[PDB]
Amino acid sequence: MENFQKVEKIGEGTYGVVYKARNKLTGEVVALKKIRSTAIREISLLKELNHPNIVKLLDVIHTENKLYLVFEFLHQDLKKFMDASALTGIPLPLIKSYLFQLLQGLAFCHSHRVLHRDLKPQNLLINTEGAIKLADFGVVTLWYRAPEILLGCKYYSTAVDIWSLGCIFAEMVTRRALFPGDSEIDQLFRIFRTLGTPDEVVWPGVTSMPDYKPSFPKWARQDFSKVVPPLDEDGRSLLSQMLHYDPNKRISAKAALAHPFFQDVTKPVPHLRL
Numbered sequence: 001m002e003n004f005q006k007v008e009k010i011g012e013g014t015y016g017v018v019y020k021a022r023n024k025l026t027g028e029v030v031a032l033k034k035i036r037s038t039a040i041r042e043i044s045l046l047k048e049l050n051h052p053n054i055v056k057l058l059d060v061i062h063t064e065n066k067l068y069l070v071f072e073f074l075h076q077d078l079k080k081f082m083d084a085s086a087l088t089g090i091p092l093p094l095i096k097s098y099l100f101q102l103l104q105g106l107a108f109c110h111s112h113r114v115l116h117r118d119l120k121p122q123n124l125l126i127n128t129e130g131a132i133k134l135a136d137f138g139v140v141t142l143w144y145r146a147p148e149i150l151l152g153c154k155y156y157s158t159a160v161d162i163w164s165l166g167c168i169f170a171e172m173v174t175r176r177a178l179f180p181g182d183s184e185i186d187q188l189f190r191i192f193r194t195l196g197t198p199d200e201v202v203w204p205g206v207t208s209m210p211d212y213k214p215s216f217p218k219w220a221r222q223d224f225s226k227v228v229p230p231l232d233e234d235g236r237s238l239l240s241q242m243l244h245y246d247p248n249k250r251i252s253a254k255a256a257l258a259h260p261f262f263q264d265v266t267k268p269v270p271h272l273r274l
């Protein structure tokens with residue numbers, strides 16, 4: 001650890017604190033995450049999970065009851081970029097590029113049986129080159145939580161990452177969070193109010209979930225044309241498939257990459273003021 005000079009705190013978190021730091025020897029600038037035997041083994045599995053859309057884990061330093069994760073440094077995250085593009089909105093071809101890249105990242109993880117589990121704009125990092133990458137592989141924000149997690153499914157699938165990414169896609173488009181819940185039930189009920197209270201028709205097995213209550217109010221569903229205007233039909237079609245209640249019907253990352261929405265995908269560069 002002494003092998004690094006701290007430059008500035010870049011953020012806190014549930015797990016640990018994140019610093020911008022400099023390798024005292026190499027000069028390399030990195031993000032250094034400080035963590036307050038099976039965790040060590042799953043961490044070391046992460047070191048092999050290399051992809052251009054996954055923040056590169058450079059090193060894992062286990063010392064004196066402290067754990068340091070050394071990551072490649074990126075200058076900006078999607079949360080701040082959204083905030084900064086608020087007045088004008090992220091241009092659609094850039095939204096589409098970011099979505100496509102994240103779908104590639106997810107198709108990679110998922111094929112290796114790795115789930116992210118906690119996707120959110122704050123953990124999506126961006127560079128000047130137009131690249132976007134997944135970070136922080138798993139108050140706590142519930143806004144991107146899939147409904148099967150909220151309903152108490154213990155053994156949820158890669159589908160939960162697709163739900164979170166749908167939520168982020170919608171938010172880039174509208175410049176407002178899709179389901180800004182401030183408690184588990186508020187999060188659940190905000191989802192129901194927009195997508196309709198789920199039942200056995202749309203999600204077989206739903207009424208048998210651990211936290212499902214027959215007393216849930218019964219809201220009718222709303223049309224996507226109301227949800228994410230002025231996203232085109234291809235985009236609204238893809239979003240509706242990323243937000244299917246049933247995790248088994250929800251589109252996979254790999255099938256999403258084939259959706260017609262991406263027929264004209266390109267890689268624009270964002271304008272970033274560092």
Ligand SMILES: O=C(NC1CCNCC1)c1n[nH]cc1NC(=O)c1c(F)cccc1F
Pocket residue numbers: 010011013018030031033055071072073074075076077080122123124125135136
């Ligand atoms: O936070 C990072 N960069 C910020 C720099 C300041 N401008 C904003 C971007 C970062 N660069 N490389 C990895 C990073 N962060 C993480 O891996 C990370 C995270 F994104 C969220 C939680 C924990 C964590 F370790």
